[PDB]
């Protein structure tokens, strides 16, 4: 990883997922903030908690194909410099989908549920169960 360069691409990915999912005048509503929260939490859960294995071939001969991406990265070290960054930024997206939501408890039940299915697998307790 290039800690400036891998984060900058990751932030620009949210900005590109926001600008394409914007105002779309058949659906002319500011709930596209909520949709930016809905797609990304389901996107991370696939590529960091569902897909299991490594994309190469014979990395270190036999290596852990029964371990997810979140728990194989950084050689299994708890809170280094990036594991915080990946668990501090999606919780900040909760704050932006409540300043432009102005809570009305119908999209709220889709934002807290989609937040817990990201926050609970990042806890350093459960490590290998699924």
């Amino acid at each position: 990883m290039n800690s400036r360069g891998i984060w900058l691409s990751y932030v620009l990915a949210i900005g590109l997922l926001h600008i394409v999912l914007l105002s779309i005048p058949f659906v002319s509503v500011p709930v596209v903030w909520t949709l930016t929260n809905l797609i990304h939490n389901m996107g991370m859960y696939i590529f960091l908690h569902t897909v299991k294995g490594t994309p190469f071939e014979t990395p270190d001969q036999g290596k852990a194909r029964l371990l997810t991406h979140w728990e194989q990265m950084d050689y299994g070290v708890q809170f280094t410099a990036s594991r915080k960054f990946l668990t501090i930024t999606p919780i900040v997206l909760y704050f932006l989908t409540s300043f432009y939501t102005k809570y009305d408890q119908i999209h709220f039940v889709l934002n807290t549920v989609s937040l817990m299915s990201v926050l609970i697998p990042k806890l350093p307790q459960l490590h290998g169960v699924r």
């Binding site: 708890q78 915080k84 501090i88 919780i91 909760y94 409540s98 102005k102 809570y103 408890q105 807290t112």
Partner: peptide, 22 residues
């Protein structure tokens, strides 16, 4: 102008800070 989540929305700021120092 909250409705009913402003306590848990308060504790999420607290849970960031409890997560940060390690």
């Amino acid at each position: 102008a909250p409705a009913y989540h402003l306590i848990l929305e308060g504790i999420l700021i607290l849970w960031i800070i409890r997560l940060l120092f390690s």
